[PDB]
Amino acid sequence: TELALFSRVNGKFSTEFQRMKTLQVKDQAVTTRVQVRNRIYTVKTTPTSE
Amino acid sequence: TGFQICKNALKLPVLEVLPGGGWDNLRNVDMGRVMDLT
Numbered sequence: 001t002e003l004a005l006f007s008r009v010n011g012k013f014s015t016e017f018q019r020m021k022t023l024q025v026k027d028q029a030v031t032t033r034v035q036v037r038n039r040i041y042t043v044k045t046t047p048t049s050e
Numbered sequence: 051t052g053f054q055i056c057k058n059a060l061k062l063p064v065l066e067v068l069p070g071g072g073w074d075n076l077r078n079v080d081m082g083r084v085m086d087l088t
Contacts, residue, residue: 047082 051088
């Protein structure tokens, strides 16, 4: 704002507002599942055992 | 009727997949030695 009256009385009025905003969200979800199953032998009793 | 005598001489594995065994046709699982293995 600038106001000059009678070419003698001067006035100035400078007003500034400034807002800055920042947001960051970061999500990580790692899931891991390992499953090993070995079956080597099948052992049975002889039918003629005691 | 062991195979250790042959293994001591030849020094070879014995073929572990052998026929002549029983078989449960229902449960689909080997059962017992029917033929004679010598």
